[PDB]
Amino acid sequence: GIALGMIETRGLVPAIEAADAMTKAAEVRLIGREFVGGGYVTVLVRGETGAVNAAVRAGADACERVGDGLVAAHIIARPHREVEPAL
């Protein structure tokens, strides 16, 4: 699975609760925590397309009310190889 799902949020409470939602809703392996700076914090998970989509949908729908909420929720199904060094 090369499908990449990921979301940033204002505050890390939503970040880690959404990460737990990612890993509990579907069989997806986390690959990144990112302190973006300025309050944005990014969770980055990797898995197959269906699991990634289901997990990210569930986590996003469960993430708004927690903390300061989401910043963005979109998914790229086939990242290019050259994007991997920029993980």
Binding site: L4, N53, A54, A60, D61, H74, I75, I76, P79
Partner: peptide, 22 residues
């Protein structure tokens, strides 16, 4: 958000969120 093609537009899953993901 432009044509779906490259990027999915506003595909909701449960309640409200765009969750366009990838």
């Amino acid at each position: 958000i432009a044509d779906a093609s490259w990027k999915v537009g506003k595909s909701e899953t449960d309640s409200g969120q765009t969750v366009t993901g990838t």
